[PDB]
Amino acid sequence: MTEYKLVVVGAGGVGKSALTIQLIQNHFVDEYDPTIEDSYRKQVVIDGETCLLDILDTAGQEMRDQYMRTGEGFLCVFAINNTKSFEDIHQYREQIKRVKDSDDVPMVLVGNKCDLAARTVESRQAQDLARSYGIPYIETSAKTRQGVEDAFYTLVREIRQH
């Protein structure tokens, strides 16, 4: 069946793992557990198509080129309460473009932790950025599960149209 190789990237502690686990195991992980590199394979049906989501959950800690080269689509995540994580996004996109020799790579910008009230990054800020990249912007919360499937499925549809 069709396999979609997705890679979740972004600064440390933004919730890359929490988002993935919610999608796969349907539960919110609320504990300190820094990732080195984990992969999740799940059979799913998206828009009537039977497919295998091969998800690579990466480390935020400063091996990148290797996984960016084989990835078909990327979920670039930042936390809406961490301005630095938002600014780091540029670095990730640039590295992905460089590795894939492409100006356009299936990508989705994800603003996570939208359940928190202490927001420091305005949605409009992220939307403008997303628009300049030419990619979708989706706000999520691994805690409430809002936008989770949305983020992942949109990335799949983006790969389908590339």
Ligand SMILES: Nc1nc2c(ncn2[C@@H]2O[C@H](COP(=O)(O)OP(=O)(O)NP(=O)(O)O)[C@@H](O)[C@H]2O)c(=O)[nH]1
């Ligand atoms: N309130 C709230 N907390 C969240 C959300 N997503 C993740 N967190 C919390 O943020 C912390 C870090 O999440 P984690 O998934 O481990 O982040 P990471 O980006 O995967 N970290 P690392 O890059 O080191 O691997 C955890 O305490 C987790 O519960 C969210 O949507 N809302």
Ligand SMILES: [Mg+2]
């Ligand atoms: Mg992690």
